[PDB]
Amino acid sequence: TLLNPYFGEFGGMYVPQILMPALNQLEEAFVRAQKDPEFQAQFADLLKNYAGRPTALTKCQNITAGTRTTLYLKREDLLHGGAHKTNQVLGQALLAKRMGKSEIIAETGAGQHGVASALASALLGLKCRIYMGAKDVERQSPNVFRMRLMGAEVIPVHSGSATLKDACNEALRDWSGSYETAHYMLGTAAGPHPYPTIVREFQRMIGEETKAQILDKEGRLPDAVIACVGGGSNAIGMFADFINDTSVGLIGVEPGGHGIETGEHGAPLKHGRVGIYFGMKAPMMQTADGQIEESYSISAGLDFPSVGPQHAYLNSIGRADYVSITDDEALEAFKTLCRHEGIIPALESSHALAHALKMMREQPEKEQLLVVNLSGRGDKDIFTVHDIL
């Protein structure tokens, strides 16, 4: 390969031999594209004039009133589509085109990636077919209809547990024979190389923007940047530009679900065991036998049973720290943001906010400049929250 497929011991390209050429082709395309002024110019044009970048960095005073905490929220919820997924999905679509590919294959848990994949494809004239877990089809019907309205062919998977992991399974199955004309648009910074690297690079503008915006408004780097972690794309996008800034803390928040001890969670990085699946070596939810399980969370977007390899590595070396937040904690953060700032965050993003609220509340006299990555809007979550209350 042109680039290192590993982040320490994590990563690799654990796919059937038949798929290696596809991975190698994609890596070469990415490397050439990254050196191409014109690829970058078009990517940037789409991000600005189509997706709406740069996103705002909102200082939230009402929520931190009475504490020494200054909180800023990176507004990815304002991005076209309502979530950060659009960023990388646009870059990957341009990559597919660079390779002369006219078709796109994608997978989804929460319909956000499929919707983002469907929108990008509609925009760039690509034939898109999405793989959704049969269960998630009925759970995320609005997202399903949206995908259809944008012309993508939605395909439910009834295999295994009929969820994200099995969907990711079907998409790969397809790609194994169609790689020649179709591009598999992976939805997070996980999977086999070069996906973890590609997704990070196509999401890094989140962190680069946050840096410029915080320097402009505060004249200094934040003490810490916090983001939820499902597969790891929104978090790594925020983290990327701050990795070499040693003074900046990088905090990833995994779903604690009903509580780590209950076993009903989706926090493999801190509460799972390293295994090999999804084409990579990374920590994951699995039985003592080695059978892979599902990640539980109130938020569907954080149901990936594994985590991006770069996150597992940044953790191992102590560069980034990972914590977990319970459904009830996220729900509370969700309610608090709506009432105090007039912003409805996605339940996913609410886990990041929930942690920042904990950092503030536990030590109210600690002076800290925090940035929470608001990865998406929670309009999609009003019903769920309403069913709980």
């Binding site: 059937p16 031999q17 038949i18 295994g160 194994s176 090999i276 070596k281």
Partner: protein, 253 residues
């Protein structure tokens, strides 16, 4: 390892190819599965390809996926699969036994330990479906020191650089223009090739052998019969017997 050596030598003396059926261990139940395997062997199978049920069959089609579901419905576990393997070996001393595995079940609690268990139960080879030549080092090394043959897939989109690696790394057999790959493998002295491109008819077996392959592997076709006679276990066996005898007849003739 060596059981493959002997089989291929024998087959050559007889001027015939090897017919190798694939089945999921514990599908549709441990007892029925053990019986299916004995019937395959009795009907003419030269070697066996056995898969252990994995939660996420990354490289498995519908037929096989359903096999895993039935196996899991019967509560089949890898530990149960190793118990079956020991019993199968105790009954049949010479048939080469190959495993079709997924990386996590091998890596789960030690790659080396997995290969130790294989050698202990009498397994001959292990093909890790999701471990490409580029990530095989620890698997092939652990396999070799436990006298297990590391099996590699030589895909259709294989370049010369891949052919050389497969030839150098593989042992027992190579999982396979076609004549080009076959002859290049032989040129590089790769383990005897066994064709695996959806073989479901007698003509496909003779064709594979005529092309210069040492044999053919049949999976879906075998499992299909099981799925069909799920309600009639005895008829399942009878049909399996007919199919295997038909396929084997096609390797010599």
């Amino acid at each position: 390892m060596e059981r493959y050596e002997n089989l291929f030598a024998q087959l050559n003396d007889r001027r015939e190819g090897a017919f190798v059926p694939f089945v999921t261990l514990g599908d549709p139940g441990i007892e029925q599965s053990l019986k299916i395997i004995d019937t395959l062997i009795d009907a003419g199978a030269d070697a066996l390809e056995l898969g252990v049920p994995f939660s996420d069959p990354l490289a498995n089609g519908p037929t096989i996926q359903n096999a895993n579901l039935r196996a899991f419905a019967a509560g089949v576990t890898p530990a149960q699969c190793f118990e079956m393997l020991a019993l199968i070996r105790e009954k049949h001393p010479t048939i080469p036994i190959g495993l079709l595995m997924y990386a996590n079940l091998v890596f789960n609690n030690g790659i080396d330990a997995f290969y130790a268990r294989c050698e202990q139960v009498g397994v001959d080879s292990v093909l890790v479906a999701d471990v490409p030549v580029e990530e095989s080092a620890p698997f092939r090394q652990a396999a070799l020191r436990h006298n297990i043959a590391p099996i590699f897939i030589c895909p259709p989109n294989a370049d010369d650089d891949l052919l050389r690696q497969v030839a150098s790394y593989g042992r027992g057999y190579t999982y396979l223009p076609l004549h080009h790959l076959i002859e290049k493998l032989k040129e590089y002295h790769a383990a005897p090739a066994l064709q695996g491109f959806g073989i479901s008819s007698p003509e496909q077996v003779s064709a594979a052998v005529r092309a210069g392959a040492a044999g053919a592997i049949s999976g879906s076709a075998i499992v299909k019969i099981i799925e069909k006679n799920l309600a009639s276990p005895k008829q399942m066996l009878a049909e399996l017997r007919s199919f295997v005898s038909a396929m084997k007849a096609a390797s010599r003739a």
